[PDB]
Design a protein around this ligand. Structure first.
Ligand SMILES: [Mn+2]
Ligand SMILES: [Mn+2]
Ligand SMILES: [Mn+2]
Ligand SMILES: [Mn+2]
Ligand SMILES: [Mn+2]
Ligand SMILES: [Mn+2]
Ligand SMILES: [Mn+2]
Ligand SMILES: [Mn+2]
Lengths: 387, 387, 387, 387
């Protein structure tokens, strides 16, 4: 029916299913998971792969013999299951040293440490076969206006990303970078708060081709933005390197609900866009099984992420393929949207009386867009209420 | 005391003081103002200049003899007062023809009309001496996911802006363009919803040097974003061509309160940044005197915009000049933020044991940032409560 | 299939389908509708009835002969169609006299006028057979802190509602009042901003039994609140006299989308609650067909409101009736939630060692709530993806 | 200058200054404080007293000899300093047993445990001299619609509060209860989400006189509501038993900034209201020193809470006392707001032609409210920019 397979490219962070349930106001409700157990259980659910922060895989401050052993055991689990590691990242947010940032910490020694910690993990990510290296600058920002000169912080952020690009080029690595925006939490305001801000920043890097975005559903929704619209701009720019899928109920703390939860209609339009555009990267879930759940509930929530993607994929494809919907799209002039405004050129447009002097503004204004009929056909398809 | 002068570069839209008070749920509470009266009253308050949409200055559908007369009378008022016109824009949002957009309307004939209407007004803006031409795509967007293919809409938006750049180049005009973001209202979601999205879009235009942003305080705040942070990114990019100043009380409808109202502390940090950065453009107010007000209240609200800017300018300068604040900034390592992370280069950083192998993470983590003391000195300066 | 009938008790405001499309930033896109035409077209769609503000039915400032004729024509249309008028209200928000409020205007003469205008329309509402009289205090509030002493305003609000209760009692009318909350828009902040605030206020009235709430989906969502939770509190209090159904995409301007649009999952849980609780009042839609639409689109959007309610009613009933869902509800201890905490009484609870001294906190904490499995069964039912 | 004294009634929670800095995404940045040290340091800053959750004072699962010793040491610190304990509360949110709630947990045994844990701490609160017992139901609510029947949960909430009222009456205690609303966090949606919802709920309790509200600045602001307006409604109801003071930058995670930070103008209008109304209870701060700070920064942030209250108290008093402001208040008809609408009675109002038949609507509408002038005088007073 809606059964996931490795072909569907579903991936999960170790820190997702492995979340112990500690929140601002509460203690852990679940024991820590061995990464080996997570890889095995996710493979059984039909996942394609898993992702990690450095410190998820190797406990912070492990010796060289400890690090080697943690990686060896994980690699054996991947080999035993056929699971992949398409993406990795660095934890630049948990340890108290990062309380004012990693790459943009006011303290220079912390900025240098953050870069060395990242570089060590890039080497490991390449060893495990990752194609994308995510950076979430969760500690980059401020609670107050004087704490952070944002122009200086952006200079430091550019310097850091430029050094990382120099490093990967020097080593001949194929890996590319993906910046993950978030507007706030845990800092009062975070730098590069949206997909737009991250895309703009990339254009100022020395080697912009090496960098894209890793947008997260709930993050754009924490700014009340339209996630499908932001994804469309990322695709338009050629910068959708990776994506984080989850749910969020509007403007509040980062909930990280399972995908499909939260804004259901936005999830529908997102899947419609990813499929229409031919996005070929991982369908990665960055979610937290609520702390109300036991281990059985963790795996049920993970399974639900994949199931909801596959239901929505079916419904979006049926919408686009329906002759009645195709007629409604023409009635709404989606065909005309895709035609050039002035392929004839500037001079021809200026000399066209039909575009101004002799344009019947009133007749054009009277023409309905027929968007409500189109949207109710979309609702009917999502809900399986066609006919 | 806090008396404005033309030197301070304060400007106002005709549509601001001239707002009749019609809202979604109410009729006009004030008669229309003649633009000549607005120019005269604003000059008396110490303004530098005024801005206009085409249809604010010339009623929509005026004949050639009518248009000429409206412009002649306005030019005489400017000449009588010494007032300038630094910026103009096009109304692509009021007339029902624009119900689905101007530049990104699904209907091709409407897109062509929108461009011709804009070009006619660029000529007038140049005649009146404007240096910046704003575009607010208030109707560009959607209420529903199927109504608007956002990739196609961005193609049409780029085509429009590229044609406008070709036009100004062909005529030898000195004018430059400024895109004004807004996240929503009047469309459910608007394209290019934030400063970041607009900056990213500009990088894809044929002649990016001709285009910048016109960010508005209340617009970024309607997405819960930090306006000073967004302005810093615009400055970092070299794209702060113009700005709209006002107030907003968080995430709701676009209030357009007088500047200083709304988020007072954010207004303080904004003025601090504009002054520190040496922003040289107009200090333009895009505000609505509340519909509770009579004409005396309109002018009081306009005067308050300028007064609040000047109070905050004084307090921000006193903050930065205070020796105790300068000491606190060093205690918080703002000096170290401005120093390069690795001027020594990538190889040197990799070979530096002090940056990783021999870095004392615990001692670094124990060092307080001293941001609370710094922020309370900022509060004390804003409130005039020092000593 | 999902065909509405008068039995389903669907009602619409004249101002909904009759909305001309004027928004803060745009002119009307549709001609005014005759109320007679609206009654006829809604009856053809399967509606039960219609509602009105005074000034929707009788243009403001009509003479006695004009008023009589407008009512006569409307009554004939109701008689011709079998349509009902279950609710009416007063427009205390459009006319510029109400710029600072009706019942809570600072000007005493305006407060008295607002009461007389309301009383005149109560008489008409009773003549047309209305059971509920709504009050939306859209102008009651402020943009600034000094403009409105809120304790004094609440005194005036109570005085107004008490006089209206005295009036209906004096005339022997059966009609009851319903207060409609909204947090903001068109005032910066509106008094009685949520269902909770309105319920609390009612408890201070002289005759609280005469007053309930008319909560609106989009209004509670403009404060980021859970609409189903608020409806549950209203039901718990015995105060759900009427309801307004529509859609809203999070925290922004009041969108008034068709019901089902906006937060789809919240619409599902709402219908589930109304049906489970046996709510017997009108299913009233307070929505705006987007201004993109022509008259055909207006009727399509109205039809979609009713269709979406009926789809969701089917899916919620199937969820509750499913044996697998009933098992999941027991697994999640919804049965135990409905049992008294201490029917044995305070003394027995104090003397129960099993409740404290001998309670195994660790074993209780280890028990998963199984909420994720339950919620995925709810998702599967909503989407028609069961098996 | 702005030096606090015990007379000013400033209080702090042990969990405020004692916050170790653990957030959703980060480890502790500060060691735990001994409550004895906190009492001593706060007394030195000019505080009046301190408040506690049970588990802040006595580590969870302490023996009878341990509990006795922790209380003895704390009582000695209070005696050594002259500090008071005006309020206490129960931690019904940290321990994993409370993952689905205390009073409204689906599991009946957990509800009974929550009541016994609360009752034990009420006895201790009375021993330490507390006048108010706060309940924050942070775990009462849901992430999903099926998890929690809200009518049943409200039945259980009422049963719990009724038992607590029976208990305090049986023991002859003078203590009263204060319910603390919050809209969300840590649950997706929390029951009793606003001041209004809590006030409404209290009216359904068996002994409503024993219960009031403990509203928190940042909590109402997390729903985008006007905190001063909500406080005014609480005062109007006679239910402002206690208050939590802090700051919040709009609609996001609960920031708990020092008081004065966040929405500065709202803080001004709040202090103005508390002082005007003669609120006599504790001025309690529920704030978190940001985790960027060391122990010196903790005490600086605490001191800043009190300093900002005292600055704003001075500015609000100067505003109200200014003859020019008194004139502006009359110009804006605040005097008329405080006069009864119809002291003459319903019949007299109906028979008054001046209130309807002969009311000049146009002349009334033309009268400006003069609110902008009034608000700019308020701004000038707050900023110390008068003349
Ligand atoms: Mn997240
Ligand atoms: Mn993520
Ligand atoms: Mn605006
Ligand atoms: Mn603007
Ligand atoms: Mn509405
Ligand atoms: Mn309504
Ligand atoms: Mn809090
Ligand atoms: Mn609190």
């Amino acid at each position: 029916n809606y059964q996931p397979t490795p072909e569907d490219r579903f991936t999960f962070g170790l820190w997702t299913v492995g979340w112990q349930g500690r929140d601002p106001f509460g203690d852990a409700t679940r024991r820590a998971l061995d990464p080996v157990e997570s890889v095995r259980r996710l493979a059984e659910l039909g996942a394609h792969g898993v992702t990690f922060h450095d410190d998820d895989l190797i406990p912070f401050g492990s010796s060289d013999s400890e690090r080697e052993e943690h990686v060896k055991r994980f690699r054996q689990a991947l080999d035993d299951t056929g699971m992949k590691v398409p993406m990795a990242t660095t934890n630049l947010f948990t340890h108290p040293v990062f309380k004012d940032g990693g790459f943009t910490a006011n303290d220079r020694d912390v900025r240098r440490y953050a870069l060395r910690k990242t570089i060590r993990n890039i080497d490991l990510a390449v060893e495990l076969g990752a194609e994308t290296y995510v950076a979430w600058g969760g500690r980059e920002g401020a609670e107050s206006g004087g704490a952070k000169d944002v122009r200086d912080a952006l200079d430091r952020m550019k310097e850091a990303f430029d050094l990382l690009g120099e490093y990967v080029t020097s080593q001949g690595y194929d890996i590319r970078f993906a910046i993950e925006p978030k507007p706030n939490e845990p800092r009062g305001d975070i730098l590069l708060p949206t997909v737009g801000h991250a895309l703009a920043f990339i254009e100022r890097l020395e080697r912009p081709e090496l960098y894209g975005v890793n947008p997260e559903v709930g993050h754009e929704q924490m700014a009340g933005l339209n996630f499908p619209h932001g994804i469309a701009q990322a695709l338009w720019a050629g910068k959708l390197f990776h994506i984080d899928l989850n749910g969020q109920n509007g403007i509040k703390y980062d909930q990280d609900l399972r995908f499909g939860a939260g804004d259901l209609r936005a999830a529908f339009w997102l899947v419609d866009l990813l499929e229409s555009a031919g996005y070929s990267g991982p369908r990665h879930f960055d979610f937290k099984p609520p702390r109300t759940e036991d281990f059985d509930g963790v795996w049920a929530s993970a399974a639900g992420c994949m199931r909801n993607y596959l239901i929505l994929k079916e419904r979006a494809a049926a919408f686009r393929a329906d002759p009645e919907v195709q007629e409604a799209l023409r009635a709404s002039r989606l065909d005309e949207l895709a035609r050039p405004t002035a392929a004839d050129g500037l001079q021809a447009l200026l000399d066209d009386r039909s575009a101004f002097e002799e344009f019947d503004v009133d007749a054009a204004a009277a023409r309905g867009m027929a968007f409500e009929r189109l949207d109710q056909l979309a609702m009917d398809h999502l809900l399986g209420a066609r006919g």
